[PDB]
Design a protein around this ligand. Sequence first.
Ligand SMILES: [Mn+2]
Ligand SMILES: [Mn+2]
Length: 269
Amino acid sequence: ATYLIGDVHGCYDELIALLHKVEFTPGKDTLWLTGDLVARGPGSLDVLRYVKSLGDSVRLVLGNHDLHLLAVFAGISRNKPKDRLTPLLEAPDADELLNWLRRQPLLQIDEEKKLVMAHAGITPQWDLQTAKECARDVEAVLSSDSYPFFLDAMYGDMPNNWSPELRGLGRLRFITNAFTRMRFCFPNGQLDMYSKESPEEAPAPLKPWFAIPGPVAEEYSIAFGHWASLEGKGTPEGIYALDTGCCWGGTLTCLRWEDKQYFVQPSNR
Ligand SMILES: [Mn+2]
Ligand SMILES: [Mn+2]
């Protein structure tokens, strides 16, 4: 069976309880995770140890908090106490875990399931070939020996409009924002990097990225996490918003792909 789970945010106990609920069995089953494995919840260290141990039985995409963790580890960014990352950063296997994490994809595609996953979704300005190329480019910088330079370059809110002519720092910044920070778009598809509200609460003319027809969404189902204020609700057919805010006192959500059956684990917080 195929299981897709939204943002874990250090909620190790809830993750394991939910996997036990569905009797997740590596070798029979595959788990997809929307990223943001770490921060806020108490168990980021245990989450990374477990997910790394799954090997080919897990298909991960990196989220914005995973990248922030890498930036803290590399000395690029300051540690925020509320993220509760110190046990992971101080662990004797921190290097092993974080060098594995920075090698993981930004984008997962299964052609037989016609299923795409990224942390924030797929901007309507991208077709599939462009999304693949951009994921490859950023994965290449993250898996290189020079990844601290890219992590430093990644921060920024511009440019917010895709063009194949984009080059350099702006190109990498846009790619990172589209895969890991996107929520709202302007009517022309341009990213808004400020509004984090639910769609009903957003200022006009902002609309969810998935409310603008894009070429990937027309051919593929898209699973994503990230957007907790969406509460996993309000999406069109073929769009699966799996982040139901476990670390916020919400729930951890698991979707089984074969029958589109949902399983939910309440937050312990
Ligand atoms: Mn998140
Ligand atoms: Mn996120």
